């Protein structure tokens, strides 16, 4: 029989949709070498060249459907034994331009997961890619040169015995795009910023141990004669005094055989090491378990008594700087039947209650 | 965040589903030479072969789908000016063997569509590719190795300019698949057959043009030393005599520019032609008009007395034999501005409240 | 295999075998059995397995 | 292990009921148990497709 073809419903412009085995569009198999480094790029393309050659059941409706509404779940199965672990980060930024750091710095800020494989069996997370909208396409992503990248920023502290592969898969949920937008507004409930606050590494011993990371956060991350930045740490650097309840993230990077115990506290930098006084201050203990790679410190506005610089001169020493620093100090010694430093991660999440003044003019450098 | 693997939808076994657009697995490119025959194969594949090199929205759903409960729509996008006319048929045999037949005759008889592109501009039908079940797969139609088959049953009455496409579009829709089976009760409401009755030709002019067509349909159609051979054809002969309303479709082949009355009529052998009182006899005229390629005769049981021989001996003369014939009698005369004969074909769809009586021994050959 | 249309069970490592300590990752599979179960026909047999 | 082992097997007798377990020849049937031995599968250690 015959029928009318202007009628029929060939201009379907709904999104992908359906279970997870129907909006699966790739797979990509990402190589952990057996002896990798930190610092160290496993995988750098354009998540568009993520489906090139690819053939699972959302595949060809993903590079033909015009609007997308929905998030791109990203999911890594990738484990091994708990006699080791290390630190991957996943990470997704809108953009690069010509010979791009890939420092784990630069690359954190917009979306990005970070796990432990020793920890979790498994780790997954969805993001928006286009960033200030609530939808996107594939054309949008392969003009727009949308960039994922795979980092290793803590190496195998046991090495296994051969080469290891992560397997990412990539689908379409059905959550809702939400746009992430920095704007000018002095008084915000919630900044986002990702700035990683920097790798600690503790030796095993029976030193005392204690690192300190500056909270004038603003004016990038050092390097040679350089500096490197985000974009959400160059947004807070916009105003000249802030304050507001830090959240952070400090996770395990070594294996669960590699023990400490980690006081956190904020104090000023004229504070010495070889004080052994630091638990008159306020402070929280970290232990970690076997289990857990993973845990938020926050830090009220009654630990601060004014507003505090966002940027410092570089030339400033510990002895004379008026800003908070936040301490890390080992409780009691590091330790472990295994050798291996006990490396770990802070990462400033966010300010809530952020609490922007004035305008900075500026300072070149970071520390 | 990390999650339960065993837990996801990753084993969705739901058939392919959703609009037109989306449950669309192949399309494909049949070509109708300028000069054409009748009983000339277009296209000749497998079923499965269908799909090879595609990239349609269900097309790896389709081959990955283990169960599927639709059916599969197939649609032809095909015209030609009013001036022609053709017809084609597309047609689904659940398989074949070694130097098979493609006469019309014998293709028909499962599930096909007819149609003259002169008149209709497109033509679409659903079937289900395992006839005696109600789901099928990929690979049980791959190993199973269904048949389609692209043919034309009576040429271009006026040839186009160049050469044509037809395009096939293989979908899946959300209908039922009905199982479609034959089986020895006597008495039935519906026996599909499917037969095909003949292709009459009628040339054009004043002469009075009669054709027979016997209702003694069993034992196949004829050949060289040989005769052709359906299932549905050879399963009504199981029955010595039979009888039952007779629903004929009668269809249009040539072009709606030659023009032609047809009266039908049930009648015996013996009534010669020119014999000019067929119009004594209870009948049918049947006047095409240009968009019309298609109408059903139905013969009551008021029609017949008695039930009549499902064969007869291939040597019985017109004279002596006591089975009634369909006659196709020019009413006035076949005309038109332009050359051409008026091809018409003739299709006993099946018997309604058929009765069937006694068991046929057998006889070898058909007419 | 090629030729043989009745299913398989495939067992595919999705990512890659892994451990600190050499080993193989041997794992067991064992038909508990078939949950409304339906035999066909008389199977007048085969003689050998695979 | 360093050393070898023992698995100390302890005999004891339940106050469960003894149920029989029969096949039959009924071509439809609810649960027909088999503890049918599929195969042991080893996967070496790597980064090789395995597929079994």
Redesign the interface.
């Known amino acids: 029989?015959?029928?009318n073809?202007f009628a029929?419903?060939?201009?379907?412009t709904?999104s992908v949709r359906?279970?997870?085995?129907?909006t699966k569009f790739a797979q990509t198999r990402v190589?952990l070498s057996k002896a990798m480094a930190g610092g160290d790029v496993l995988l750098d393309e354009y998540l568009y060249d993520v489906v090139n050659g690819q053939?699972?059941?959302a595949?060809?409706?993903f590079l033909?459907t015009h609007v997308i509404t929905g998030k791109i779940k990203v999911?890594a199965?990738?484990?091994?034994?708990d006699?080791?672990g290390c630190c991957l980060m996943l990470a997704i930024n809108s953009g690069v331009r010509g010979k791009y750091s890939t420092d784990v710095y630069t690359i954190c800020s917009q979306d990005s997961m970070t796990?432990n494989p020793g920890c979790?069996?498994?780790?997954?997370?969805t993001f928006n890619p286009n960033p200030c909208g609530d939808s996107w396409s594939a054309e949008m992503i392969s003009r727009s040169r949308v960039r994922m990248t795979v980092i290793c920023v803590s190496g195998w502290t046991?090495?296994?015995?051969?080469?290891?592969?992560?397997?990412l898969d990539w689908s379409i949920v059905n959550e809702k795009c939400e746009p992430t937008i920095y704007h000018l507004a002095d008084c915000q409930n919630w900044l986002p910023l990702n700035r990683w606050m920097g790798k600690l590494t503790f030796p095993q011993g029976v030193t005392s141990e204690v690192r300190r990371m500056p909270l004038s956060i603003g004016g990038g991350a050092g390097a040679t004669q350089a500096f490197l930045a985000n974009m959400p740490n160059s947004w807070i650097s916009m105003w000249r005094y802030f304050r507001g309840e830090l959240h952070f993230e400090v996770t395990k990077m070594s294996s669960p055989y590699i023990k400490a115990t980690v006081t956190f506290l904020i104090a000023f930098g004229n504070l010495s090491d070889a004080f052994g006084f630091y638990e008159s201050f306020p402070h929280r203990i970290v232990q970690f378990a076997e289990v857990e790679e993973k845990c938020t410190l926050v830090f009220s506005q009654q630990e601060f008594v004014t507003a505090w610089s966002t940027q410092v001169n570089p030339r400033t020493t510990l002895e004379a700087d008026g800003c908070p620093y936040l301490y890390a100090i080992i409780h009691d010694s590091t330790t472990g039947t295994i050798s291996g430093d006990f490396n770990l991660g802070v990462k400033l999440v966010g300010i809530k209650d952020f609490c922007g003044i004035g305008s900075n003019p500026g300072i070149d450098g970071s520390r």
Chains 1, 2 share one sequence.
């Open positions: 029989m015959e029928q073809l029929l419903s060939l201009d379907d709904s359906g279970s997870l085995l129907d190589l053939d699972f059941r595949t060809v409706a033909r999911t199965t990738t484990n091994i034994s006699n080791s796990w979790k069996k498994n780790f997954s997370f046991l090495s296994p015995t051969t080469d290891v592969i992560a397997k």
